Structure 1
């Protein structure tokens, strides 16, 4: 008897599926229904390994399944070429991006193909190509006319490594999103923005009905951070100008004893007294230079300066000094606040430190407030010392005081958002050119829609297209020395480029019509496929892609190009793949494990001396090495950096594809993080072989048997096996739909054993043939190769045209289930009686269990409970 040989059949079938084009995405989905499985396209930068294939596999499983059912499936794939990701890589190897990319893509598609993953490559999209980024511009225009795009000064975040500005969404832990070790600074610059805030309300409101992981939504809710409150205006003493401040506690206005402007606030210097200037101006240059990692280093220590100017409390009418502290942020609300030390610790503390007054205006219900106050009081209470509002409740106060303000034109009720506008301009070469020009008489003028695209200057000198603080395009007149399409005089093209995320915010839409030269996509098409039914990806893109993408769709909706309003209906996340890692040598002596500094450092711990326990307890092991010393191993993220990846190409050659799959899918729950291991790969081998044998050993026997039979006319092991099948089909089918591939397979392995047990007391019967047919169909999504192979030994056409097995509910019905006999809550034993078996029939079959255990303890009884299902309790 032959044996399971991967290299023999895999690459064969792969070519087969590609030729016959089963995953070709239909232009316009018919009436059979349609699925749109999509995995976030990759940043071409490196070579793929098991750590990466997790996702694309999933997408494939899910994609093959649906296609098998009948749905018209669209499983697309393309490359997120432009932006920092690629450039940052091509720059670390002194290579030209256009070459480093097309190369990385080639390597990629090869891996994917080896893994037996199919796509509709006739839709492949490469962001960095003109044929695509042209539309990135077209959109930018449509956003300009609609006033959602714009330019403006102010402090922006600067990444010394990337040598360019980043959006707030790209500042994780106060560091770069790609360089989690490089702090971020601020620089006065005028960049281009996208008025995403214009959609703050909708972005937050349309989350509700969204069926996403509660973890993600909650992050967007928090990132958008809506807050209802009031915008009060404080007149400046003598001056004509008025200062707007936001507050979610206007019912305390009469308690405001001072104002605090953000260092970067304009009026912080335009009001700073000449005798204070030499200090105010020195404080700004101190805050601007400080950073996030530095600020969080000082703690909650309040620090500010007095502006030497006063303001007029529009409530009491009196004067209150105006200060400037860093604890107030300019990028939020009004960048100014009305300090009320009496009902806000922050303010309070700031007050007790810089000798400022604390006025009480909210009394605590019942238990009076200890005078003098030694801690704020932020809870609701009764108003006092607040003019005619005295006695008025706290809650009812707010709306009244606001209604009072909106009467004298002193303020108004407003709702600010934490969400800050999107900064999309980058001073890098590899990027989409902003379709704007700069005339001196006309000003900032938008390039004509029909003059698009605006190709990127062709630059070969690698040391040329490198960021040094300014836009690499700011050195090629041959590009920007163009004319203004308004007047006709000398103009200048904007040297800045669109951030990567821009093009990665509507790609899912391009796949629906990847070859359109009239529009970013034909609405008719996009509407037929959208929304994305299932989006496999990560969480790190919570406040980025998963946000920017929605805004983009909504705006595209508002142009009447896309019927839907949320691009991703389903959002399935995945966990990180891991692998046991070599953390260096160790000197073991008895039960003591000394740690040499080279290792201890990589382990990122303080201790330089553990024990054989501390090692176990932290999930590690000491193994023998090739250098003749012991090495401390431990799992770790499977990444290039860690140098522990399991390259696809190699692996597949030395093992097989379907093996990789089963290993990845069955390892754990997809949402959880797996740890790719030797032992696992083995299991995949075993599982796959046993599937082979079982079918190879009956190939002949099966070849001469018919798979036709009468359902009910079944009895014996057959009737049973047939039930086990359908019982299994249920599980597989459900789990595939819910995206629980692990248990979906665990169920397939279980039936397999069931088949081995059925063949020790029964021959290749019609029911059995059917079992095998059904099994092969249920396998096709996880091990499409080995599945397509065995299937052909008996049937003609591809498993793709087989369709998915039909469940037979009536086959699930159980007859003679095993029941547990318990007495006073302990499980004494288990009998085997029909499901409907009457209490008397069970009781009887119980009273004489294996060891009559039921008697060894039930010699009294008082009440008995029977549950047809699987239980019978005797209350002694």
Structure 2
């Protein structure tokens, strides 16, 4: 008897499914929008990417079989840093690089039997897409959500551009993990995402997303209970407002500090102090914010010779000015609480100011004297009637009391900052603004979009050196002012890649509209995304930014939903066994040579055998005569451990790779790509083929029609097992439990073998085989389709999903 042979059959079915257009989505649709995170065309796709993309294909096929109108699209996140950094690293022009990579990625997807509605392809670096970036940008400008501001920004010296706060990961560039970001002062474009902070927080509650992602976004947004508190100045009319995120500490405010630039600094200075204060104010203004944000620097300040009354204690406190208080934040004035704020602690110690404890540490009380500030939550003490209150609650109680007594007011604030979107890079969407010497910043009219990127041909011209490459090109930026008609300069910064990806899932609903980003009728018919699949690395990047874009476009009236992704599933990383290099072992201790340690990215030069085990590593004898330390590491280019699709499917096959992926572990978990997994996939597919091949002749002479209620013995038993299997596989598919679905098919395959020991090929067996192939199709579609055609005329796409007999489960 012949054996399963994936060669030839896969190419045959791949072409068939595409020709037939089974995965073409209707312009207006039950619907299911199954979305996977579209890739940066920055390199070869490997099995890691293909775990994400096979997962979407499984669900898309399953839903399509059930009768849903299914939208399952693909496209290219082709602008900004990832495409351009990759092209530039290999001295290639971005456009050439991007389209070569797209061609390769398409083939990788096709060869795995993944099916998209390719009629909905988007390529974000094309003006047919980026013109709509520009349109959205103009609407944001119009609605008070896009602005230019001077201030401190994060700078990647390798990218040679500013980055958004979200693109800084443990102090490093999201793209250059070895490179600490630096601070610069620059005038840049921002999207006012903080205008949506409360909605972004509150609207997480209804969401079928992993709790870890919700927690990351909650922490990132970082809502806090704050207050403005008024301090009356002794002998004066003015009451100084201070902004505080610790209103619970008010009874411990022992002095006030005003920014040097605060109008009251010179206004309140005693006559004899004025000279000294003015000199200090002038010295401060000679510094940069960075310089005033510097630490380890001398603590400086001047006492103004003025006092304020603490509104809680009714006690007189001195008013100082000091460099460390910045004029542009809060009210430009602070209450200093040396017992609980370390900056104030060090200042008070230097200048001999009182330190007063008002938050007690739970467990062991704070010592006397206090040697450093106590900055964590505790129990209010020396705080009059608030004594004993847990301090976070006490914030709310002090705010209520302030408001009641006319002494201040609650002010809610957020850790979240506005989104720095402009980039000093060529390969990105031009910002649709003009700078006129007379009018200021003026928008490009909607009717002139796109503002086309100029076609720079020389890679060395494009290479970013600190300024936008477009600054070298007056043929692009020299223009006329739309407002007054005089000479003006186009903005020369471009939009970050995350602009593009914040609405692509809407473009897929209307991919060729040349009058709007999309028609709301079409978007609203397909939205929200029923199931989104992609990596947790986007938790506060794309998965936050997209929610902002959707709420904005909703507020413009263009989108009915306020949440773009109703379900989000974060897939764990595919890892590969990776050689980190030689080690030496003596007893229980493994010595790591420097190059081995550095590749592992760990501080230890010595690990115990137990440490090696616990990190998932092992020691393997090498030909070089040493033991090498091997460990699973995330599949990626940087580790040189990618399993690429072309070579693998040529040597083995697509269904083999699909089963390897899908069976390895729960999809939310990490998995290791292994030879054992590949062999297990072969064993299963071979066993399916063998069972059906063994019975092919008998199956051809058997009808599938029977009456379930007349079955007896093993026939009745098989019918029950069949429906148990169907229930389990269907529910697992709905839940993305893909590995246990496959386990259920493996177990039912065993049942089919066991059945055939006692029973011949019967009508019920034929129906079981039919149903088996239908249930197999989302997972191993090529084999399923191959065997289906041995007995039945049309595609598995046309066969439907089998109907569950609930009575069979009793």
Q: Which has the larger radius of gyration?
A: 1
User: Which structure 2 segments of 5+ residues have no match?
Assistant: none
- 2:341 maps to what in 1? 344
CA contact (8 A) 2:260 2:284 kept: yes
Change (3 A) 1:589 1:263: farther
| 1:612-667 deviations in Å (ceiling 9; x for gaps) | 66644543333344556543322111111111111111011000000000000100
Q: How much does 1:110 deviate? A: 0.5
Change (3 A) 1:403 1:117: closer
| 1:100-147 deviations in Å (ceiling 9; x for gaps) | 101110000010000000000100001110001000000010111111
Change (3 A) 1:752 1:407: closer
Aligned positions of 1:239-638 closer than 5 A: 244-250=241-247, 253-260=250-257, 320-321=317-318, 333-334=330-331, 336-341=333-338, 347=344, 351-352=348-349, 355-359=352-356, 411-586=408-583, 595-605=592-602, 608=605, 615-627=612-624, 629-638=626-635
User: Which structure 1 segments of 5+ residues have no match?
Assistant: 812-874
Moved more, 325-334 or 642-651: 325-334
- 1:834 maps to what in 2? none
- TM-score scaled to structure 1, two decimals? 0.83
CA contact (8 A) 1:50 1:646 kept: yes
Q: How much does 1:341 deviate? A: 3.5
Aligned partner of residue 36 in structure 1, secondary structure? strand
Change (3 A) 1:262 1:767: farther
Aligned partner of residue 492 in structure 1, secondary structure? strand
Aligned-partner Cα distance in 2 for 1:795–1:291: 77
CA contact (8 A) 1:434 1:494 kept: yes
Aligned positions of 1:846-861 closer than 5 A: none
CA contact (8 A) 1:135 1:519 kept: yes
CA contact (8 A) 2:225 2:395 kept: no
Select the residue among 728, 732, 735 that pairs with 1:731.
728
- 1:202 maps to what in 2? 199
Aligned-partner Cα distance in 2 for 1:284–1:174: 33
- TM-score scaled to structure 2, two decimals? 0.89
CA contact (8 A) 1:183 1:293 kept: no
Change (3 A) 1:2 1:176: same
CA contact (8 A) 1:184 1:291 kept: no
Change (3 A) 1:468 1:241: farther
Moved more, 152-161 or 374-383: 374-383
- 2:804 maps to what in 1? 807
Moved more, 305-314 or 690-699: 305-314
Aligned partner of residue 512 in structure 2, secondary structure? coil
Q: How much does 1:683 deviate? A: 0.3
| 1:477-532 deviations in Å (ceiling 9; x for gaps) | 11111001111111111111111101110010000000000100000000000000
CA contact (8 A) 2:292 2:324 kept: no
Moved more, 648-657 or 619-628: 619-628
Q: How much does 1:38 deviate? A: 0.3
| 1:64-122 deviations in Å (ceiling 9; x for gaps) | 00001011000001000111111111110111101110111000001000000000010
Change (3 A) 1:364 1:112: closer
Superposition RMSD on alpha carbons, in Å?
Answer: 4.7
CA contact (8 A) 1:37 1:74 kept: yes
Aligned-partner Cα distance in 2 for 1:567–1:732: 28
Change (3 A) 1:187 1:423: same
| 1:414-470 deviations in Å (ceiling 9; x for gaps) | 111111111111111111111110111111111101111100111011111121111
Change (3 A) 1:361 1:673: closer
- 2:22 maps to what in 1? 22
Aligned partner of residue 438 in structure 1, secondary structure? strand
Change (3 A) 1:254 1:290: same
Moved more, 650-659 or 625-634: 625-634
Aligned-partner Cα distance in 1 for 2:401–2:696: 88
Q: How much does 1:307 deviate? A: 8.9
CA contact (8 A) 2:293 2:324 kept: no
Task: Give the number of the structure with larger relative contact order, counting CA–CA contacts within 8 Å between residues 6 or more apart.
Answer: 2
CA contact (8 A) 1:68 1:800 kept: yes
Q: How much does 1:540 deviate? A: 1.1
Aligned partner of residue 191 in structure 1, secondary structure? strand
Change (3 A) 1:793 1:287: farther
Aligned partner of residue 460 in structure 2, secondary structure? coil
Aligned-partner Cα distance in 1 for 2:107–2:285: 48
CA contact (8 A) 1:123 1:514 kept: yes
| 1:370-421 deviations in Å (ceiling 9; x for gaps) | 9877887899999999899999999998778657766897643211111111
Report how many aligned residue pairs link the two structures. 810
Change (3 A) 1:80 1:368: closer
Change (3 A) 1:472 1:589: same
CA contact (8 A) 2:292 2:323 kept: no
Change (3 A) 1:269 1:697: farther
CA contact (8 A) 1:183 1:291 kept: no
Aligned-partner Cα distance in 2 for 1:685–1:281: 82
Change (3 A) 1:99 1:697: same
Change (3 A) 1:286 1:118: farther
